[PDB]
Design a protein around this ligand. Structure first.
Ligand code: A1AKC
Lengths: 39, 156
């Protein structure tokens, strides 16, 4: 059986670490809700 | 039990010890998570019980205690924050500029951040603190890195 535990408030933080790129990807979404790369 | 708004961990005692299978968002008395995290199962909140109210495997979303409440959307221009809640670690905000998933049914924002699978369900926020989607349904690229859709539901 699963349970929930509070982890924090939903707020934007001014001193957050900034990282990650912004790729443009062609993808397909199947009936099981899974994404796959299409090239 | 705990109905206060905020970000929550989703835990199980089925596997070894206590394991974090995912994350969710409590807002307006409704718990919002990704379908692959709970597979539609009931949740416990202290001594209280959360029952699924709505869900869709193709959207990979599920709501508890009421209908989907999160209606904000990425503007397609500005940076956002992943409020990452990794297993056994403190909630941490990470700022990024989303990329794009181009599909035959239209375009969706995507965040290129690598976190363990138990981070699925962590909310993605706009500059006003509104939840524009959940992190955790996406694709693995070239070296094993992860890129997640910004997955959002519809508020009726
Ligand atoms: C169908 N499904 C989709 C997921 N999604 C993840 O597992 C997942 C979610 C967030 C970060 C990393 C990951 C992954 F690398 F792939 F491990 C799990 N099950």
């Amino acid at each position: 059986d699963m349970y929930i535990e509070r982890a924090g408030d939903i707020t934007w933080e001014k001193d957050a670490e900034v990282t990650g790129n912004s790729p443009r990807l062609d993808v397909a979404l199947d009936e099981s809700g899974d994404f796959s790369l299409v090239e | 039990g705990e109905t206060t708004d905020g970000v929550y961990r989703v835990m199980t005692r089925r596997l070894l010890g206590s394991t974090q299978v995912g994350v969710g968002v409590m807002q307006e008395g409704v718990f919002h998570t990704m379908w692959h995290v709970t597979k539609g199962a009931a949740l416990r909140s202290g001594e209280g019980r959360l029952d699924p109210y709505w869900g869709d495997v193709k959207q990979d979303l599920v709501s508890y205690c009421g209908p989907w409440k999160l209606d904000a959307a990425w503007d397609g221009l500005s940076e956002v924050q992943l409020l990452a809640v990794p297993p056994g670690e403190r909630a941490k905000n990470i700022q990024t500029l989303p990329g794009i998933f181009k599909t035959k049914d239209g375009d969706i924002g995507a965040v290129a951040l690598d976190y363990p699978a138990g981070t699925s369900g962590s909310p993605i926020l706009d500059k006003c603190g509104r939840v524009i989607g959940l992190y955790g349904n996406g694709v693995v690229i070239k070296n094993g890195s992860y890129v997640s859709a910004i997955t959002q539901g519809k508020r009726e």
